Amino acid sequence: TLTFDHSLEAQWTKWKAMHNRLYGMNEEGWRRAVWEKNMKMIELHNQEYREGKHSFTMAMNAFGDMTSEEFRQVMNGFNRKPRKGKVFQEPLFYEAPRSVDWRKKGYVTPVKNQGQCGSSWAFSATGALEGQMFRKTGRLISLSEQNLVDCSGPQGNEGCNGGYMDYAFQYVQDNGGLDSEESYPYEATEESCKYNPKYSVANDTGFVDIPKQEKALMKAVATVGPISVAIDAGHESFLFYKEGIYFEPDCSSEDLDHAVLVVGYGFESTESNNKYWLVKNSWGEEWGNKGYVKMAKDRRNHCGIASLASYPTV
Ligand SMILES: [Cl-]
Ligand SMILES: [Cl-]
Ligand SMILES: [Cl-]
Ligand code: NA
Ligand code: NA
Ligand code: NA
Ligand code: NA
Ligand code: NA
């Protein structure tokens, strides 16, 4: 789609080089038009942010030239049977703190990147299990999402098409283990099961589903550790989120399409609409705030953060 703002040429050339992009002549043209449309969308949003019209900023990242089909590959197809897990019982007399950050306590591995594969359910599951294994042993070991992708078909998952964290937790229970990231590295595609129990570094005894309430989620995060959740991530504002508390008016509490990990919660030093969930994504460190997003908290289950929350028991 020819016609380009050539004042973006230097940024476009740099962006292509930073993201290993090289196009023939026809593809160069329309990819550049998609990227420029997004650049201008981001720049306008941020201008509006500087005028106090949004709670968060946006930034160009690795999604800048993608088409709809490519976005869908980074979105979870999810097949929602009744949930089955044990029900989380709120500890009434535990006093949850005003702020939690499990990263700072050693529960959380570095940010990963699911690539062009609908495997966020697997990253969410490994993140929750990484946290529970650490709480149990004091050993932080990155776990194999590829193991889950290749092997948990029987439990109901569909590899890069999508899956559920509870199905992943069920697989680890049935299977008696899960291999380490180091032994079973991630390939961003579905392949034959290669689980080797000699390299298993995790186990689980089941899983717990949290009631669909932000209060219950807050108490779960405070008392358990990181929690697997699913959200409505299907908006440009999230795809190119940079910093701040994310609040998207068009967000749904019911229609979820992407799994993430809640590792904490807190508040901004200004005035209470100032609370947030601390959320680890699986879109690499280039996305968001070094791979993290602050999601609006206590704003009527914004983006469904409490609608599909669970954790494994170990
Ligand atoms: Cl600190
Ligand atoms: Cl450690
Ligand atoms: Cl509920
Ligand atoms: Na601007
Ligand atoms: Na640690
Ligand atoms: Na990464
Ligand atoms: Na910013
Ligand atoms: Na900034």
Swiss-Prot record:
SMART domains with a match to the protein in the record? Inhibitor_I29, Pept_C1
Please indicate if the UniProt record lists Secreted as a keyword.
yes
InterPro entries the UniProt entry points to = Papain-like_cys_pep_sf (IPR038765), Pept_asp_AS (IPR025661), Pept_cys_AS (IPR000169), Pept_his_AS (IPR025660), Peptidase_C1A (IPR013128), Peptidase_C1A_C (IPR000668), Peptidase_C1A_papain-like (IPR039417), Prot_inhib_I29 (IPR013201)
**Positions of Zn(2+) 3 binding:** 166, 209
Which EC number applies? 3.4.22.15
Subcellular location as annotated: Lysosome; Apical cell membrane; Cytoplasmic vesicle, Secretory vesicle, Chromaffin granule; Secreted, Extracellular space
The molecule here is called Procathepsin L
Q: Which gene encodes it?
A: CTSL
